[PDB]
Amino acid sequence: GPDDYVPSQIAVNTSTLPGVVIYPRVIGELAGTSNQYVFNGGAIALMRGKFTPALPKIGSITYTFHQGNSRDSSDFDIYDIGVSGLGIIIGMAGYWPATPLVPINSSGIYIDPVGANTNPNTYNGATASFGARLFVAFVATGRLPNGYITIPTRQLGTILLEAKRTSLNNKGLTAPVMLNGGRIQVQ
Known part of the structure; x- marks a missing residue:
């Protein structure tokens, strides 16, 4: 179908x-x-x-x-x-x-x-896809101990697809934005 857009996530890797x-x-x-x-x-x-x-x-x-x-x-x-x-x-x-x-x-x-x-009337130029780029930075809110800190996988948020044509806009399709867990080395 013309409005059968299907989502796929965007993620960054702790590693x-x-x-x-x-x-x-x-x-x-x-x-x-x-x-x-x-x-x-x-x-x-x-x-x-x-x-x-x-x-x-x-x-x-x-x-x-x-x-x-x-x-x-x-x-x-x-x-x-x-x-x-x-x-x-x-x-x-x-x-x-x-x-x-x-x-x-x-x-x-x-x-x-x-x-x-x-x-509110501004959209991207006509295309059959929507993409994104993701940038993430770790922040130390306090003195960290030396060693390996485990970072769990967390959904950072969600991208919502809006379009000029109402039928595709009415679907309200969303895709998840992910931080993939791992470990970080503090020294």
């Missing part, structure tokens, strides 16, 4: 965090991930994605990612992943490389096109 050697402060960036087909399957459409955080907000911090097209600094919300002394911040963007990193500092924001945040 990509370098070894922490050192409040609150950023202790490292996970590898940025990309998925051109977070929503795929239907016919060509004008589409946009809205991210909704799923984790409690425990603080805020200024930061600039080294990975994405991040020119200025921004306010990020520190989210709780249920690990003492730790927190994470999120930044998202459209799949295409020129798009800007969208810091997550609210309960809802359009990650692509970023213009939809200031114009």
Whole structure:
């Protein structure tokens, strides 16, 4: 069917965090991930994605990612992943490389096109897919002990698919945004 878009997740991997050697402060960036087909399957459409955080907000911090097209600094919300002394911040963007990193500092924001945040009629150009880029950074909220800290898998939030044509917009299709657990080495 023309509106038979089906979701697929976007995730970052804890294992990509370098070894922490050192409040609150950023202790490292996970590898940025990309998925051109977070929503795929239907016919060509004008589409946009809205991210909704799923984790409690425990603080805020200024930061600039080294990975994405991040020119200025921004306010990020520190989210709780249920690990003492730790927190994470999120930044998202459209799949295409020129798009800007969208810091997550609210309960809802359009990650692509970023213009939809200031114009409710704005969608991406006609395409048969919607994708995203995911950036995550670990934050130490307090002095961390040396060793291996376990990080559980947590759903960081959800991308909601909106489209110009009402039938696809009415489906309200969503896809999950994931942090894949593992361990981090503090020294």
